[PDB]
Design a protein around this ligand. Structure first.
Ligand SMILES: Cc1cc2nc3c(=O)[nH]c(=O)nc-3n(C[C@H](O)[C@H](O)[C@H](O)COP(=O)(O)OP(=O)(O)OC[C@H]3O[C@@H](n4cnc5c(N)ncnc54)[C@H](O)[C@@H]3O)c2cc1C
Ligand SMILES: Cc1cc2nc3c(=O)[nH]c(=O)nc-3n(C[C@H](O)[C@H](O)[C@H](O)COP(=O)(O)OP(=O)(O)OC[C@H]3O[C@@H](n4cnc5c(N)ncnc54)[C@H](O)[C@@H]3O)c2cc1C
Ligand SMILES: NC(=O)c1ccc[n+]([C@@H]2O[C@H](COP(=O)([O-])OP(=O)(O)OC[C@H]3O[C@@H](n4cnc5c(N)ncnc54)[C@H](OP(=O)(O)O)[C@@H]3O)[C@@H](O)[C@H]2O)c1
Ligand SMILES: NC(=O)c1ccc[n+]([C@@H]2O[C@H](COP(=O)([O-])OP(=O)(O)OC[C@H]3O[C@@H](n4cnc5c(N)ncnc54)[C@H](OP(=O)(O)O)[C@@H]3O)[C@@H](O)[C@H]2O)c1
Lengths: 445, 445
């Protein structure tokens, strides 16, 4: 067999690691080719100063910015087969900067000798499936040689992410506003906004954190705005939450309650689309961003062609070790170890069950536990280690409590690794004062 | 016969008009489908506040910005078959704002009844060619219905532009700079830079004009930097021209002559790439931006597959009337009124002749006349009516002298129409004071 993996972010890398681990235990594995658009692996964790289009003219994948740190407890994303202690030679604090988690992600696969399977600077242009040959044809462009070519595969595993194509709504006045307007995707350096009055549109992670970076790096004020309900945290005194934006007139933002605030810049933290520029209708996943992803049997096998799989397409509480659970499962399906239902109706019913169960309660603890149950389900079916998933849940619950206590100080907390049991040490510098985001500053005294 | 046109900017619109004109005169024409990525026609002239990726997730085509006006004399682009005075019912000044030129472009195509052939929100994903069937297969994605489809064609005419995929060179310090760094392609509102010291990198039209907008809308200072040769105009007191950038250290820019200065913002006016994300090796034009475009017989027929054509791929002195000449020629080749050489070597020799002749002199007037000669060559070979091309050259020559005299005031000049023979009136407001860019303001009596 031959298998194509699209993407070398955490999910695609997990897929490579999964196959290699099976080979380490004596199993025959397919030939694997991984196509990656960027010049290096790491996916969203691979920072670039560039925005919009990259050095090759392709859409910039990176949505991360300077000064970004882990926004959940690292203990919730630890690889079960490669602990933080194994990688770093010691335990570290619970919310590491981007560069530190990048180092961890790449350490696992560097040691696994899977880089040689990856073709970098090679965006996939198209995938088609031919029922006669039972092959997928992947067409890719190699930017190193400026040559487009194609190759045939028995399986395609799409791990191309869903937090890179921005959702960018228009509001009245956006086109006549005379200040900076930027989506979270293209945000890079919070220092740009020092001394400024910023409008942050949105009510989730990007709004929380981009507003917080603006705060930390000296913005004059933050006005965030929500649609349905406020974020409701204990914000600093130069941060105000407003209900829905109605319009901009000059510098003046008008909100649903009739209030106004003058602002210098607008940052749209309005989320992302699932978007695949390189897929035909019969292979192209269409879904909302949620815990039960449409049209994915077991959350991974495409119901309209289950020789195609997708990784990481769920909305995320769990991240790295969920992608691992998925990758090990997909590997085992491809190796013939796990049976796929032959009846499409059964695959559709699996998804329907997942959707109904996700919807049964709107409680946040219920949501976290729902995804934990998904990880448990997948891990039970393969030889990925059976780890303390409930303890990961405990870390997420404590994190939630810390955020509610003090949204600006939640990163100044420690949790126990569920892999090695070690309570994270206290970091040497409180988050607000830790202006240097380098791995070297973080890991050294 | 079936023909696909990719793009509904000035070139694609010219192509539709060429076919409709032939039909109006009683000729049988092919079935025509025009695919356009944006929601409306006009190409670069269709303004959007959006940058990077559009509402559909596609690369934003627009490179135009607030306050943009015609940068050459309108008399030099005035449509051979449709005067400004006719469209507006009166004479107007010689450098109309974007909105005014868009209205003019639209007027002509509305009259032509060609919109029926255009599919908007429908980027082309791919074109392939089968030599056995002599058919192109065009795959396009309809963003309104979220459905990709394909269709077969005898010819493909690519009019997708070459001033939209930015050339974005890395210089030391760009990744660490504390300030806005933006390519011309993503520049929208000069007012963002009021009170700032702006660095403008480049020495062509974008550098001239974006620096000028920043000046007009209140930047504290402009520093422009060139690498090859200086623009060398008579700059205003707060504009300095420097040689090549060596690096930034913090906010300090260091130049090739050993000089330094601190800057708050950087605008990269470093040009664009010919880039086609949707073409395989056998169809994909590769060329520098120049008057003699590589691999294009008669500047339009792809030498490696002469059933494929390209419009507007040349660097531009002439624009609209050249695209018309090209469109009429391509139409005639497709209708069989013009016969292409059956010998590839002859086609390659045509391109080599054009390249050698372009290179024979580096004189600006020589370049302008070189492209005028090209327009004349094409017009002589079709039923496109000859017009006073030499008079248009005279307008460009006067424009060149006006820019050399006063770069900040060149738009405060008039030229004689080569279509109506009338000298353009003086505008009601000097360019520096004309802050309102609306069509209504411009046309006020
Ligand atoms: C701003 C931001 C901050 C985040 N912070 C955290 C955090 O602190 N903790 C956490 O656990 N999670 C975080 N996440 C979640 C993130 O989803 C996961 O951490 C993880 O990166 C998802 O991995 P992935 O491999 O599924 O997708 P991605 O990381 O998006 O990688 C997908 C890969 O596919 C490649 N690709 C895309 N299109 C093509 C193509 N046509 N051809 C070839 N290759 C292609 C991309 O270049 C990329 O390498 C964050 C997400 C964002 C957007
Ligand atoms: C900033 C700027 C200012 C300018 N100012 C002037 C001026 O004052 N005077 C002047 O004479 N000229 C000016 N020009 C020159 C400009 O090149 C021409 O005026 C003209 O717009 C070129 O026409 P075009 O149709 O060849 O290309 P474009 O105007 O670039 O249009 C190409 C079209 O192709 C579409 N397209 C691209 N890719 C795809 C795809 N995959 N599928 C479907 N559709 C696609 C685009 O959306 C667009 O509609 C300017 C150019 C720029 C960049
Ligand atoms: N490590 C970090 O610090 C960090 C920083 C940024 C992001 N991340 C990650 O990035 C991923 C995505 O987070 P995200 O916050 O960008 O996306 P998200 O969780 O999908 O949230 C989207 C937000 O946009 C809002 N929204 C959507 N359309 C809107 C509109 N037309 N008008 C106003 N609001 C609109 C939503 O509000 P409604 O509920 O009203 O629809 C919602 O608040 C997550 O994994 C997150 O953890 C991490
Ligand atoms: N109507 C208007 O007011 C207006 C405004 C803007 C643009 N436009 C239009 O846009 C089109 C393109 O104009 P343009 O000026 O953007 O592009 P251009 O004419 O192609 O010029 C590109 C410029 O970038 C420079 N450059 C390229 N690579 C560089 C690098 N690595 N470092 C430094 N400099 C670099 C080039 O310098 P070298 O010569 O040294 O290579 C050149 O000066 C034209 O049609 C123009 O008329 C119109």
């Amino acid at each position: 067999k031959r298998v194509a993996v699209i993407g070398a972010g955490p999910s695609g890398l997990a897929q490579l690691r999964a196959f290699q681990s099976a080979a380490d235990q004596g199993a025959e594995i397919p030939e694997i080719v991984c196509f990656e658009k960027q010049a290096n692996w790491g996916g969203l964790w691979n920072y670039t100063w560039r925005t919009g289009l990259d050095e090759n003219g392709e859409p910039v994948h990176c949505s991360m910015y300077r000064y970004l740190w882990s926004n959940g407890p690292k203990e919730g994303l630890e690889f079960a087969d490669y602990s933080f202690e194994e990688h770093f030679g010691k335990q570290i604090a619970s919310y590491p900067p981007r560069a530190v988690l990048f180092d961890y992600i790449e350490g696992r696969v560097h040691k696994a000798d899977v880089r040689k399977w990856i073709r970098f600077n090679s965006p996939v242009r198209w995938v088609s499936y031919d029922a006669e040959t039972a092959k997928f044809t992947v067409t890719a462009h190699n930017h190193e040689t400026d040559s487009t070519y194609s190759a045939a595969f028995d399986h395609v595993i799409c791990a191309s992410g869903h937090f890179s194509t921005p959702n960018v709504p228009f509001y009245e006045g956006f086109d006549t506003f005379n200040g900076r307007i930027v989506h979270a995707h293209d945000f890079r350096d919070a220092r740009e906004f020092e001394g400024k009055d910023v409008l942050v549109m949105g009510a989730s992670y990007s709004a929380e954190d981009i507003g917080s970076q603006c705060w930390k790096y000296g913005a004059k004020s933050i006005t965030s705005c929500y649609r349905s309900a406020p974020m409701g945290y204990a914000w600093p005194d130069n941060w105000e939450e407003k209900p829905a934006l109605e319009k901009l007139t000059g510098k003046t933002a008008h909100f649903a309650d009739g209030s106004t605030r003058d602002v210098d810049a607008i940052i749209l933290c309005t989320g992302y689309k699932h978007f695949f520029s390189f897929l035909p209708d019969d292979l192209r996943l269409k879904t909302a961003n949620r815990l039960a992803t449409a049209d994915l049997y077991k959350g991974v096998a495409y119901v309209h062609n289950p020789a195609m799989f997708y990784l990481g397409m769920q909305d995320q509480w769990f991240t790295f070790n969920m992608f691992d659970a998925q990758a090990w499962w997909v590997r085992d399906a491809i190796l013939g170890r796990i049976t796929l239902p032959k009846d499409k109706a059964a695959m559709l019913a699996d998804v329907a069950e997942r959707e109904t169960r996700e919807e049964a309660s709107d409680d946040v603890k219920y949501a976290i536990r729902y995804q934990a149950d998904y990880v448990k389900e997948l891990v039970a079916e393969t030889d990925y280690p059976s780890f303390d998933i409930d303890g990961a849940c405990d870390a997420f619950f404590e994190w939630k409590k810390h955020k509610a206590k003090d949204i600006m100080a939640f990163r100044d907390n420690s949790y126990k690794s569920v892999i090695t049991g070690t309570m994270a040490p206290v970091h040497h510098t409180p988050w607000k004062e830790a202006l240097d985001d380098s791995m070297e500053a973080y890991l050294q005294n």
